[PDB]
Design a protein around this ligand. Structure first.
Ligand SMILES: O=C(/C=C/c1ccc(F)cc1)N(C(=O)NC1CCCCC1)C1CCCCC1
Lengths: 9, 224
């Protein structure tokens, strides 16, 4: 989800 | 049969990214089930933050599709957390620190039916006498598992996992030459590590019942 995508990028 | 130059390049990359800590100030806080739970969740949140940073640096990880990158991170987070916990349980820490950590986890709303397997697994890991390289490689292998749910391109993941397993096999020969079953022993512990996915899901539902609240990052990665 958004938090994981934010941390990955 | 030592490491090839590309294997040495791979190992060093893994080592540099692995050695980049979860324990800030456990001590500054009082002891009671409520505070022990909050410290526990604070350390697990810090571990997820360092896990994501290590993962994004694994060779080839950035080449994988975005959805497969997320599937690998969610599928490995709990196992990587138990492996890191086993490393810390076996880490030589100052006189009292391990004992305080251990006492906090025993009074944090976790049933002793989970504490028993946990600490039995941790003691089992310490008897292997793993080097920092073995812990770094095992973590990378756990993260780059081709048999996680929701992976659209499994051969791409296996292509990344395969060289890491080859390196681990060689390190076992170099660092544990008197135990030829050492590599097989490490993969046997990975099998035992997978049983914690079920145990964790049980601990989560017990905590939810007693109205425990989790941090935003743990809510996303553990699907709470
Ligand atoms: O057993 C754990 C962790 C347990 C745990 C965490 C979350 C959860 F939902 C269920 C269980 N230990 C730990 O230190 N955990 C911290 C947080 C994770 C990352 C490592 C640090 C040991 C306690 C004994 C001393 C050595 C360490």
């Amino acid at each position: 989800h958004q938090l994981l995508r934010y941390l990955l990028d | 049969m030592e490491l090839t130059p590309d294997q040495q390049t791979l190992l060093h990359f893994i080592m540099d990214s692995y050695n980049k800590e979860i324990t800030n100030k456990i001590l500054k806080e009082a002891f009671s089930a409520e505070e022990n739970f909050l410290i526990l969740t604070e350390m697990a949140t810090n571990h997820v933050q360092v896990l994501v940073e290590f993962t994004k640096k694994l060779p080839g990880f950035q080449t994988l599709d975005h959805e497969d990158q997320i599937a690998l991170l969610k599928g490995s987070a709990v196992e990587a957390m138990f492996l890191r916990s086993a490393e810390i349980f076996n880490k030589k820490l100052p006189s009292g620190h391990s004992d305080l950590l251990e006492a906090r986890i025993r009074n944090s709303g976790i049933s002793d039916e989970y504490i028993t397997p946990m600490f039995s697994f941790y003691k089992s890991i310490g008897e292997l006498k793993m080097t920092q390289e073995e812990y770094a490689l095992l973590t990378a292998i756990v993260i780059l598992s081709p048999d996680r749910q929701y992976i659209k391109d499994r051969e791409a993941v296996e292509k990344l996992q395969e060289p890491l397993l080859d390196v681990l096999q060689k390190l076992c020969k170099i660092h544990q030459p008197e135990n030829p079953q050492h590599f097989a022993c490490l993969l046997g512990r990975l099998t035992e590590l997978r049983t914690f996915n079920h145990h964790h899901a049980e601990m989560l539902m017990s905590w939810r019942v007693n109205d425990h609240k989790f941090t935003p990052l743990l809510c996303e990665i553990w699907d709470v």
